[PDB]
Amino acid sequence: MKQYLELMQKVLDEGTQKNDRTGTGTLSIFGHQMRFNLQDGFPLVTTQRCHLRSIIHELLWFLQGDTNIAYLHENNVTIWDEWADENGDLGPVYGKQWRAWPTPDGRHIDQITTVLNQLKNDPDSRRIIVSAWNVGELDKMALAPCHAFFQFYVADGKLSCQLYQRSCDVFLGLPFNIASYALLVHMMAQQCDLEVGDFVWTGGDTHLYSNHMDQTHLQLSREPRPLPKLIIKRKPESIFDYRFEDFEIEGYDPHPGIKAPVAI
Amino acid sequence: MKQYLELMQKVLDEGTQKNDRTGTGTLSIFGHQMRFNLQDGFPLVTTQRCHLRSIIHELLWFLQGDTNIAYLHENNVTIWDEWADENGDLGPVYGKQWRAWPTPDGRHIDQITTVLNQLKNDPDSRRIIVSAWNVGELDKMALAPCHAFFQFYVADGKLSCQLYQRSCDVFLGLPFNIASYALLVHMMAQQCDLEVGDFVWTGGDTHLYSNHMDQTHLQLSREPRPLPKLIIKRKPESIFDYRFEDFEIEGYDPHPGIKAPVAI
Numbered sequence A, B: 001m002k003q004y005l006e007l008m009q010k011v012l013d014e015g016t017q018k019n020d021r022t023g024t025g026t027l028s029i030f031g032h033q034m035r036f037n038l039q040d041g042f043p044l045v046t047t048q049r050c051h052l053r054s055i056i057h058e059l060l061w062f063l064q065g066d067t068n069i070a071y072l073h074e075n076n077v078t079i080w081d082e083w084a085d086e087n088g089d090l091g092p093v094y095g096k097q098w099r100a101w102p103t104p105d106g107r108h109i110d111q112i113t114t115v116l117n118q119l120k121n122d123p124d125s126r127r128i129i130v131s132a133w134n135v136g137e138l139d140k141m142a143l144a145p146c147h148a149f150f151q152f153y154v155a156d157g158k159l160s161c162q163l164y165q166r167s168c169d170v171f172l173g174l175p176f177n178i179a180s181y182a183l184l185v186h187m188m189a190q191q192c193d194l195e196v197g198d199f200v201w202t203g204g205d206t207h208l209y210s211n212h213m214d215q216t217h218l219q220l221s222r223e224p225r226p227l228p229k230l231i232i233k234r235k236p237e238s239i240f241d242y243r244f245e246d247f248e249i250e251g252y253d254p255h256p257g258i259k260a261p262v263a264i
């Protein structure tokens, strides 16, 4: 995509050389924003094929409040195997915080339901947020949330969402996070009889791993193509009832994929 | 300041009327980003007078872990008055989450000292965060955190910071929040022997109240002036040991103030 490729070139031209956790080294920049008007089409990168099944399954997985890769397996999604433990468990990550943020007094708060109700009953609210950044349980998480905080906004029957990503594997992860939250907005908009609006993406440590230079240059030389369109062929009775078949996407004529190693 | 003034112009050009809870009506936009190179100067608005006195005191107050107006009062700062209960208690707001976010297993986390230990031993970390958005105790707070989430970054011996403000009263609160965090960056940096880099501001519902238009236009019709300079005259043994007096602001020649009624 236009913005996606500009953000990539930017890391190359401005990124600072940093030594990271994995000891691989990256080119980093701090703070950056991208806006995506959903009216123009789904933000699924075209300069590289991306499987919507991957994206669509992990998201449904979160909305389920599940933190065990079992399900993700029964559908060939593996990006979460490396971190899950012996029993395929990752701890109180994303799903757990979205669906059951544990209170100190021993209760649970369902941010999604709350958010659903706020959208339906009080769209002007400026407290329509949901964050996975639970300081009290980070140590228990197999890994700290990258996309850790997002907020919904409504104006003229349009539903927007701004995502704050503290850490961002520009080449590997970004394309997926974008599509995922873009897909969630659509779902929320459907269950709330709203029209989709803007998807604002904000990042903290935005980086490009040193051993991704080649794949990047390659991708940087490809011409982007019109964005596809997302079709949801059925409206479940809730936001926790969508399924893989429900979504469809036309107009996706991407360039072939580009293989790259993941940094552990 | 240019950034602040351009922001105000932006909300006026691309804003959209919205009805807030105080039923006052705002003109808002969603998502925005501005950077301030603390090296260029201290970001205290000049197109309108501000009192560093108050800013400092509220900040020292946060760093204390105090959520009771008594302190603020013993110092003539009264902005929080409106929201304090009969005992000057605001609930587990800012200061409390910073110094003692309560975990579910009876623990309490001091996000401030943590960040200080990280800026010292693992500055390359991508998870140097402080969150005030504690979903668990949100119902006990007098107000839901506006400046609710921030992140630090280090590069070339310079400390940077990015703040996510879910809600922003562009005319009233913004000026103070900016100067405040900028003030925190200089302090952190001093404790860690770093140099000040950039302060990046990112916002959610960035609005202007209806009763603030004539004033925002008056201010908007003013020429900015050179940013003042911040001078610390003592390096305390800890970030929690600063006193009002250690701070010295230089060359601040602002225009006259401008009164506008706060929205309850």
Ligand SMILES: Cc1nc2ccc3ccc(CNc4ccc5c(c4)CN([C@@H](CCC(=O)O)C(=O)O)C5=O)cc3c2c(=O)[nH]1
Pocket: A049, A050, A051, A054, A055, A058, A077, A078, A079, A080, A169, A172, A173, A174, A176, A177, A257, A262, A263, A264
């Ligand atoms: C260093 C690093 N670490 C991570 C750790 C955990 C992650 C969890 C999720 C995501 C992003 N979301 C998805 C969601 C689905 C898939 C993958 C990623 C990528 N992927 C195939 C590639 C599919 C494609 O190219 O379409 C793979 O095995 O990489 C998936 O099935 C990224 C990371 C990163 C990441 O991007 N970088």
Ligand SMILES: Cc1nc2ccc3ccc(CNc4ccc5c(c4)CN([C@@H](CCC(=O)O)C(=O)O)C5=O)cc3c2c(=O)[nH]1
Pocket: B050, B051, B054, B055, B058, B076, B077, B078, B079, B080, B169, B172, B173, B174, B176, B177, B262, B263, B264
């Ligand atoms: C609608 C709305 N509500 C708020 C509620 C609580 C706030 C708490 C802090 C701040 C921002 N930080 C400071 C820090 C110091 C001062 C004030 C604000 C503004 N202020 C006025 C005096 C306000 C008063 O003391 O009554 C001044 O110009 O000195 C202060 O002393 C803003 C709000 C808002 C805000 O900006 N807007």
Ligand SMILES: *[C@H]1C([N+](=O)[O-])C(=O)NC(=O)N1[C@H]1C[C@H](O)[C@@H](COP(=O)(O)O)O1
Pocket: A021, A143, A144, A145, A146, A147, A167, A168, A169, A170, A172, A173, A174, A177, B125, B126, B127
């Ligand atoms: C982390 C991530 N996740 O774990 O769920 C995701 O969805 N997208 C990412 O971009 N992402 C990446 C960023 C970074 O390179 C690493 C983790 O490193 P650290 O925790 O920030 O030190 O994963």
Ligand SMILES: *[C@H]1[C@@H]([N+](=O)[O-])C(=O)NC(=O)N1[C@H]1C[C@H](O)[C@@H](COP(=O)(O)O)O1
Pocket: A126, A127, B021, B143, B144, B145, B146, B147, B167, B168, B169, B170, B172, B173, B174, B177
């Ligand atoms: C809230 C504030 N604070 O609580 O400390 C601050 O620092 N500055 C602000 O700009 N801010 C404003 C934004 C908005 O107009 C209200 C909060 O309203 P809700 O979003 O309904 O809670 O105060």
